[PDB]
Amino acid sequence: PGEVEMVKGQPFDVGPRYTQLQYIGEGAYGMVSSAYDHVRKTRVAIKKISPFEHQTYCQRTLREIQILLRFRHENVIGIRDILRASTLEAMRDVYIVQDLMETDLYKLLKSQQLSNDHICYFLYQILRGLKYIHSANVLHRDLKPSNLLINTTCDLKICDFGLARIADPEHDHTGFLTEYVATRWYRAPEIMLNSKGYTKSIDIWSVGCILAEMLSNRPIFPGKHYLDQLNHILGILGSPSQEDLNCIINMKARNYLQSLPSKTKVAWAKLFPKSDSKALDLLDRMLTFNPNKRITVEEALAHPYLEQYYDPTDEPVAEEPFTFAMELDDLPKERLKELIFQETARFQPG
Ligand SMILES: *CCC(=O)Nc1ccccc1Nc1nc(Nc2ccc(N3CCN(C)CC3)cc2)ncc1Cl
Ligand SMILES: C=CC(=O)Nc1ccccc1Nc1nc(Nc2ccc(N3CCN(C)CC3)cc2)ncc1Cl
The missing domain is CATH 3.30.200.20 (Phosphorylase Kinase; domain 1)
Incomplete structure (x- = not known):
């Protein structure tokens, strides 16, 4: 005792x-x-x-x-x-x-195929949570299945905020192949090209990867190393459009992209032949190559896939945005x- x-x-x-x-x-x-x-x-x-x-x-x-x-x-x-x-x-x-909590989504996806009902409703809860997080200008920056806790009544809660930061669009730019801390498989393409992951679009991408994973019980982009992660992403999304290339002016990033053989986007319905077409449409909009054309969390909640649960009077937002100075990181x-x-x-x- x-x-x-x-x-x-x-x-x-x-x-x-x-x-x-x-x-x-x-x-x-x-x-x-x-x-x-x-x-x-x-x-x-x-x-x-x-x-x-x-x-x-x-x-x-x-x-x-x-x-x-x-x-x-x-x-x-x-x-x-x-x-x-x-x-x-x-x-x-x-x-x-x-x-x-009872379990995490990782554990659940290792042990069972989810119904469309469960996929939809988990996705809704993730986005509901993320709406609140983004409404305080907070970026989670490490969304993945093992950071989503689930209890016996299918309630879902986002966890592990250790890599969170404040949205800071003025300082998002960085060089090609800059080191990054968050889990490789859920990193958006721009992390590897020109982005520090300081805008809300990087969490949307991760949510896209999580939806893909819920539809097929496997990671959609399982890169074996830093550059391989980009290569997995481009293998499915295809050659960026000229408009999307013209938003990238890092010389090494552009020349890398332009060196790759031409490839057309793989149809989501071909990778996910037994998935709801409304879910694939939402997946398409979350996993857009260009972060500026990626759906926002509000728009994702309003998407037809989530229509049984969507209820903007029951999707609360934070009192007030938060601020964390860069100088914290040098203390x-x-x-x-x-x-x-x-x-x-x-x-x-x-
Ligand atoms: C939220 C981020 C975090 O702390 N995640 C994490 C990681 C490992 C162990 C626990 C844990 N956090 C929490 N877990 C629970 N409940 C819970 C989670 C996971 C399991 N299993 C253990 C083996 N695998 C790690 C997954 C299945 C069981 C129970 N509740 C709250 C927290 Cl903070
Ligand atoms: C959007 C781009 C994309 O995925 N297109 C593509 C199309 C076909 C095959 C691969 C790729 N892309 C990759 N290919 C490489 N390297 C590589 C270089 C040259 C070649 N040639 C040599 C000779 N050439 C005539 C045909 C094949 C093959 C692969 N690294 C990473 C990737 Cl992601």
């Missing part, structure tokens, strides 16, 4: 309110457990984050905490509680308490640590 429960050889020091911990899964500097909450008498998810040796991990922890404490929406995961030591020097890790990790201490203060003490 009063012990420190181990999860996979890692102490999870969340007693006495939270006990009976079981492993759920891991990310790069994070481990998630389920636990019993003795105060609310229910099982919860607890994420242990140990970020304070790396500036980039600190950036991501603060970013996710600042965003999720300020968001409240049915299709976005909430923060219920945060535990950390009483003093800054003692604080070596942070525990984020969240609603325990020493000791300063990020103090901001995480501050942001988590309102949940003290145990």
Whole structure:
């Protein structure tokens, strides 16, 4: 009693309110457990984050905490509680308490073919969530099936906001083949050509890839390495039009694109011969090569595919947009640590 429960050889020091911990899964500097909450008498998810040796991990922890404490929406995961030591020097890790969900879309797509009904309704919930996120000018930037939690009543919640940023269209440009952090398979084509992923179109692309994946139970663009990802995308979308090329003036990007043999766009109905044609039309508009011609989240919700669920009076938006200065990303990790201490203060003490 009063012990420190181990999860996979890692102490999870969340007693006495939270006990009976079981492993759920891991990310790069994070481990998630389920636990019993003795105060609310229910099982919860607890994420242990140990970020304070790396500036980039600190950036991501603060970013996710600042965003999720300020968001409240049915299709976005909430923060219920945060535990950390009483003093800054003692604080070596942070525990984020969240609603325990049954599964993720990744798991579900590995285990079963979805009906059209389920595909449609998951897509709607993803877009409903994303409307709220984008209404605060926040970009998720890492939407994929494993970042979509699902419970036993088919409720879906978006999670993992560690790579989120504010839409910043004035500084989106970068060079050809610039390094990128988000999961390769869900990266839009422009990430590899001229874009830092600072506009809302990059989340729409990822949602397109998720729809494709829900229709066929496999990733649509599974690149084996950075450039291969672009090549997979162009293999299906075909040779960009001249109008779309003329929006790219990075010389190396254009010359790469212009070196490829001519190829016409593959008909979605040929890749997805047994899918609803309305779903394929929406997929077409989400996976457009040119980010400027890609459908917006509002337009996607209004699309005929989602018509059984579409209800703009029941699709709320955030109070107010958010701002995060570029200079945050240059703060020493000791300063990020103090901001995480501050942001988590309102949940003290145990
Ligand atoms: C939301 C992003 C994130 O933290 N994802 C993640 C990754 C691994 C483990 C847990 C987890 N987060 C949460 N999980 C749940 N519920 C839940 C998710 C996944 C499973 N399975 C474990 C094995 N695979 C990772 C998928 C199936 C079970 C339960 N609830 C809340 C959070 Cl934050
Ligand atoms: C939109 C573009 C597209 O997908 N078109 C295309 C059409 C046919 C085959 C491949 C491709 N594209 C790719 N091809 C390459 N490299 C490559 C270079 C030359 C050739 N030739 C050599 C001689 N030529 C006469 C025919 C084949 C083949 C492949 N890398 C990446 C890709 Cl994505």
